[PDB]
Each structure stands twice: as structure tokens, then as C-alpha cells.
């Protein structure tokens, strides 16, 4: 019973464990606290593998093998699931919240929308189970997560290449982080919040002076106004770079 009680405790814990979810503004179900159940699964797997060392392992070998298989499947599910959520959450900050960036990247936006719909369907299917161990019984759950993580990583690589090309277009952008560069790029129709990054990419220049749709000049960090010779005309379709 010194082993029976440990196996019963493992089963009892896994018959009640369930991930905590918080609703997202896009309708997705985000999971909080990935660490607790992952650590519990890993520790239970270590306990199961150390159980085989005891010579009393034969009596409960069948149950130990069933639990070992179930927990290995759950670990393989969790490892992909956490990072799928991480990549989707990172990419949603870039795409899906700004129309201009979506216009710049139509293929990436379409693929991201399809991935979001598929992941939403999978998560809605999985969270009805009310238990985190029953998710392994969902058919092709792991393969769907692998496809989603691969597509999200490829989208992220495409986005990174696009940002590097954008920097190479205007080398001053290298002084701005990816977040700031995307804030500049997405500011298509506005083209007035770019001035907040002037002190970062242009050094002395603090902001820009816009008159109607013309750039009359810039001003330094000391408040000195510099007036351009020919005022630059801005349109809605003109790129920030």
C-alpha cells in the first residue's frame, strides 16, 4: 500500500486538475499559470519512473504503464500548447490590431486569421472537457498544435524579414526597437505620432512641425525651430519610410 497510495494520489490529482482560463478580447480562451500543471506532470512522471525501481512494481505495473503513457502524452501536448499560445499572443500584438500593418502584409494577415480560427475551434473543443488530462483523448490534438506552431513561427520569420527590409530602406530605423518601428509603420494616416521617436532616431531633433499636410520643419530638444526650404507634402498613401 505504500506504493498503492502514491498511485491513487496521482490518479486523484489528475482527475481534478484543470487549467485556469481568462477570456480574450478576440474571443480566444487564454490559459493562465502554465507552470503548475506542467511541473505536476513532470514530477508525477519522475515518481512513476522511480516506482519501477522497487521490486513491488509487478503488482501495479499495468496501472503504472497506463499512467506513464497518459502523462507522456500530456507532456507532449503541454510543451507545444504553451508555446503555441505564446507565439499567437505575440503575433496578435502585431497583426489584427492595426489595419495599416494588415494592408502591408495581406498573406501573413490571412494566414494568421485562419490560424486564429483553427486555434479557437481547438481550444473551445478542449475546454468543454473540464479536465486537462482528458485533452489527450481529443483526436489529432497534438498534430494540430504542431501545425499551428509551425505556421506561427513561419509567419514570425516573414515578419522579421519584412522589418529588416524596412530598416534597410531607412537606416535610421535601426535606432528604434521592433515595437517602435511597428508603431511608426502602422501610423499610416496619422503620420504625427512618428515625432515621438525623432529624439530616438534623429538625435537632436525632438519632434516635427506639421502644417495642414505639409512638414514646415522640425524642432530640437532645446525648442529651437528649424524651417525647411521646401515643405514636404504628405499623402495618405505615402509610406513613412
Partner 1 sequence: KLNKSSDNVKKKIEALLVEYLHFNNVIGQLKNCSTKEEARLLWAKVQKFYQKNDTLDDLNSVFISQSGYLLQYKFEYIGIPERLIYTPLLLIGFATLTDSLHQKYGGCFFGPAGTGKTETVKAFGQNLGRVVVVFNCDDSFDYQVLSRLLVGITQIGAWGCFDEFNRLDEKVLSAVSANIQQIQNGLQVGKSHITLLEEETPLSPHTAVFITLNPGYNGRSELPENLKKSFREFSMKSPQSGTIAEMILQIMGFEDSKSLASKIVHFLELLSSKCSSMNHYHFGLRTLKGVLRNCSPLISEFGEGEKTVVESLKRVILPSLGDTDELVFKDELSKIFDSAGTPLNSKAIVQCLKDAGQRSGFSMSEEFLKKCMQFYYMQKTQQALILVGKAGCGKTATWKTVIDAMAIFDGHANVVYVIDTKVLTKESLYGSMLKATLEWRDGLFTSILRRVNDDITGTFKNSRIWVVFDSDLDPEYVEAMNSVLDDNKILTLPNGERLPIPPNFRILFETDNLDHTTPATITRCGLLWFSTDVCSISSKIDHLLNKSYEALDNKLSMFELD
Question: Checking DSSP bridges between strand 214-220 and strand 205-211, what pairing results, if any?
Answer: antiparallel
User: Preceding residues of all breaks in the chain (C to N beyond 2.5 angstroms)?
Assistant: none
Indicate the residue among 229 and 237 with the shorter CB distance to partner 1.
Answer: 229
Q: Which of 89, 99, 121, 154 binds partner 1 (CB under 8 A)?
A: 89
Q: Which of 46, 117, 203, 232 binds partner 1 (CB under 8 A)?
A: 203
Question: Of 7-15, 32-40, 44-52, 208-216, which segment contacts partner 1 by CB under 8 A?
Answer: 32-40
205 near partner 1 (CB under 8 A): yes
Q: Which of 43, 224, 233, 238 binds partner 1 (CB under 8 A)?
A: 224
Cell 498534430 belongs to 143
* Helix axis angle, 61-94 to 141-169, nearest 10°: 30
107 near partner 1 (CB under 8 A): no
54 near partner 1 (CB under 8 A): no
* Residue 177 phi, psi (nearest 5): -70, 170
Q: Give the span between the Cα atoms of 59 and 182, in whole angstroms.
A: 61
Q: Give the span between the Cα atoms of 79 and 34, in whole angstroms.
A: 10
H helical segments located in 128-226: 141-169, 178-186, 198-201
CA separation, residue 164 to residues 150, 157, 173, 178, 188 (Å): 21, 11, 9, 10, 19
Q: Which of 174, 193, 213, 238 binds partner 1 (CB under 8 A)?
A: 174
Q: Give the span between the Cα atoms of 241 and 239, in whole angstroms.
A: 5
231 near partner 1 (CB under 8 A): no
Per-residue DSSP letter, 59 = T
Question: Of 37-45, 121-129, 139-147, 166-174, which segment contacts partner 1 by CB under 8 A?
Answer: 166-174
Q: Which of 1, 2, 5, 22 binds partner 1 (CB under 8 A)?
A: 22
228 near partner 1 (CB under 8 A): no
Q: Which of 59, 99, 154, 221 binds partner 1 (CB under 8 A)?
A: 221
Question: Of 6-14, 103-111, 120-128, 221-229, which segment contacts partner 1 by CB under 8 A?
Answer: 221-229
Q: Do residues 145 and 83 make contact, with C-beta atoms less than 8 angstroms apart?
A: no
Residues engaged in binding partner 1 (CB under 8 A): 22, 30-34, 82, 85, 89, 93, 167-168, 171-175, 177, 202-205, 218, 220-224, 226
Amino acid at each position: 500500500f505504500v506504493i498503492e497510495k502514491s498511485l491513487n494520489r496521482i490518479k486523484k490529482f489528475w482527475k481534478e486538475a484543470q487549467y485556469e482560463v481568462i477570456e480574450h478580447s478576440s474571443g480566444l480562451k487564454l490559459v493562465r499559470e502554465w507552470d503548475v500543471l506542467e511541473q505536476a506532470c513532470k514530477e508525477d512522471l519522475e515518481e512513476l519512473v522511480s516506482m519501477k525501481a522497487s521490486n513491488y512494481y509487478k503488482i501495479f505495473e499495468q496501472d503504472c504503464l497506463d499512467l506513464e503513457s497518459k502523462l507522456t502524452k500530456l507532456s507532449e501536448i503541454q510543451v507545444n500548447w504553451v508555446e503555441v499560445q505564446f507565439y499567437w499572443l505575440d503575433l496578435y500584438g502585431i497583426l489584427g490590431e492595426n489595419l495599416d500593418i494588415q494592408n502591408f502584409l495581406p498573406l501573413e494577415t490571412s494566414k494568421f486569421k485562419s490560424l486564429t480560427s483553427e486555434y479557437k475551434m481547438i481550444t473551445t473543443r478542449a475546454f468543454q472537457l473540464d479536465t486537462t488530462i482528458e485533452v489527450i483523448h481529443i483526436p489529432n490534438f497534438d498534430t494540430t498544435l504542431k501545425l499551428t506552431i509551425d505556421s506561427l513561427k513561419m509567419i514570425k520569420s516573414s515578419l522579421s524579414t519584412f522589418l529588416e527590409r524596412q530598416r534597410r530602406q531607412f537606416p535610421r530605423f535601426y535606432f528604434l526597437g521592433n515595437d517602435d518601428l511597428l508603431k511608426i509603420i502602422g501610423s499610416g494616416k496619422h503620420h504625427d505620432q512618428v515625432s515621438k521617436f525623432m529624439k530616438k532616431m534623429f538625435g537632436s531633433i525632438e519632434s516635427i512641425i506639421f502644417l495642414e499636410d505639409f512638414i514646415t520643419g522640425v524642432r530640437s530638444v532645446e525648442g529651437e525651430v528649424l524651417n525647411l526650404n521646401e515643405k514636404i507634402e504628405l499623402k495618405d498613401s505615402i509610406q513613412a519610410q
